[PDB]
Amino acid sequence: TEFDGPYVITPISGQSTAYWICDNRLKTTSIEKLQVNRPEHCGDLPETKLSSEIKQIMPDTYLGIKKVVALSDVHGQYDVLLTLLKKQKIIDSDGNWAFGEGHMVMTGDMFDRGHQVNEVLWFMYQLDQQARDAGGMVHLLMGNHEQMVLGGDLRYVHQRYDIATTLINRPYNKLYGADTEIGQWLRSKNTIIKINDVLYMHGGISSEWISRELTLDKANALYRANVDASKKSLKADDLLNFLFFGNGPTWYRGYFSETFTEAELDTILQHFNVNHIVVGHTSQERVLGLFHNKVIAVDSSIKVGKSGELLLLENNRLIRGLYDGTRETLQ
Ligand SMILES: [Zn+2]
Ligand SMILES: [Zn+2]
């Protein structure tokens, strides 16, 4: 049988309510002053204190950040994420943020394929709040699977979540709908950000972005306002169509094409006045650089459920952080 959740409903006024799947049955609890507490007989599903701060919209451009860590495409593999962050000493063994005033960029795709999606989400919500408390930040970016799940494209959701949708009687997209805590938190997030001289997004930026004279702020605001729209309306708008489909920031795989050129990459770098672009989405066997490290791939195949790696940007170095805790300088 399954243990899964919580799924928290947070109304515009009043207390929230938590839904728990416990031994393939539903338990529902009223939340008392922001403490999300697990009912009896329900495994050790995560408990969280709700936070309003981390659902506030934050800037998408940052200056002077001394150290950054980036990783991506966890795809519901909590055990792997936790071990990697423990090995690399980003968290303490208790799982609490230990990275000080550093910034973490998770470049999308927390959802789908894996069987520990809510463990990943509540862990990242906790880390988001703890980072802020320490003067640092977690940037949870939206990947193509965040967009798919929130929008109702449920092709890649693990079978186990059929228990939650049946018992709670909501389709999976509405288990993360706008009246849910996690759905509100996600709807506050950015899709493309810039930290120092590095640009971060899930898939990559195509030359079409330039043609369309887009900006970070305009794209991130449109992503927030439309992640809820139908495919037909997305399809219908020329710019939303670009943003949400295959040549856009969350699906583009062009940097990984054997025909893509450094020349074209250089025009993108020049456009954004950056020296590097950090992307997930296209899975690699390790964190690696392309084009003389102008692109760093940080989808390290955590989705396979065995291991993963991260990128550290600190002291003007680019460092590969391995699953065993070791480090190798990329640049
Ligand atoms: Zn992915
Ligand atoms: Zn992806």
Please determine, looking at this structure, whether the domain spanning 1-331 carries the CATH number 3.60.21.10: yes
Distance 3 CA to ligand 1 centre (A): 24
Distance 89 CA to ligand 2 centre (A): 26
Distance 66 CA to ligand 2 centre (A): 28
* Structure token digits, residue 74: 């966890």
SS3 319: strand
Distance 330 CA to ligand 2 centre (A): 24
Domain locations in the chain? Answer: 1-331
Residue positions forming the annotated binding site for Ca(2+):
73, 75, 109, 144, 202, 281
Ligand lying nearest the CA atom of residue 74: 1
DSSP assignment of 19-88: EEEETTEEEEEEPBTTEE---TT-TT---EE--SGGGS---SEE----EEEEE---TT-HHHHHHHHHHT
Distance 298 CA to ligand 2 centre (A): 11
Distance 12 CA to ligand 1 centre (A): 32
Residue positions forming the annotated binding site:
73, 75, 109, 144, 202, 281
* H helices, E strands: number in the chain: 10, 17
* Structure token digits, residue 116: 């520990």
Q: Judge residue 60's burial from the number of C-beta atoms within 10 Å of its C-beta, 0-12 exposed, 13-18 middle, 19 or more buried.
A: buried
Q: Resolution in A for the shown PDB structure?
A: 1.5
Inter-helix orientation angle 78-87/117-134, to 10°: 30
Distance 251 CA to ligand 1 centre (A): 10
User: Residue 285: what are its φ and ψ, rounded to 5°?
Assistant: -75, -5
Ligand lying nearest the CA atom of residue 112: 1
Ligand lying nearest the CA atom of residue 251: 2
Rounded to whole angstroms, the Cα distance separating 182 from 62 reads 25
Neighbours of 44 (CB within 10 A): 7
Give the contacts of 159 (CB within 8 A, at least 6 positions apart): none
Distance 48 CA to ligand 1 centre (A): 26
Rounded to whole angstroms, the Cα distance separating 77 from 218 reads 32
Task: Assess contact for 278 and 105: CB atoms under 8 A.
Answer: yes
What was the experiment behind these coordinates?
X-ray
Query: Strands 310-314 and 103-106: what pairing?
Result: unpaired
Residue with tokens 């001394």: 66
SS3 124: helix
For the chain, the 3-state helix, strand and coil shares in percent, each to the nearest 5, are: 30, 20, 45
Distance 214 CA to ligand 1 centre (A): 24
User: Residue 306: what are its φ and ψ, rounded to 5°?
Assistant: -110, -35
Residues with CB under 5 A from ligand 1 (ion): 73, 109
Residues with CB under 5 A from ligand 2 (ion): 109, 143-144, 281
Distance 85 CA to ligand 1 centre (A): 19
